């Protein structure tokens, strides 16, 4: 989990999702691409 002000898609398998008012990046291919805006 990477927590930062600037959360982006890092590859084609990255997906932007808003869960409970928090922008997150969830990736099906790379665990290092998992992000939470904060």
- Interface ranges with Zn ion (CB under 5 A): 10-11, 13-14, 27, 30, 33
CB of 6 to RNA, least distance (A): 6
23 binds RNA (CB under 7 A): yes
Name the 3-class secondary structure at 37: strand
In the DSSP assignment, the letter for residue 21 is T
- Beta strand pairing status for 14-19 and 2-4? unpaired
17 binds RNA (CB under 7 A): no
Residue with tokens 């990477």: 2
User: Where along the sequence are the contacts to RNA (CB under 7 A)?
Assistant: 1-3, 5-6, 21-23, 31-32, 34, 37-38
């Amino acid at each position: 989990m990477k927590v930062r002000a600037s959360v982006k898609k890092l590859c084609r398998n990255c997906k932007i999702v808003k869960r409970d008012g928090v922008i997150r990046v969830i990736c099906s291919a790379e665990p290092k691409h998992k992000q939470r805006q904060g």
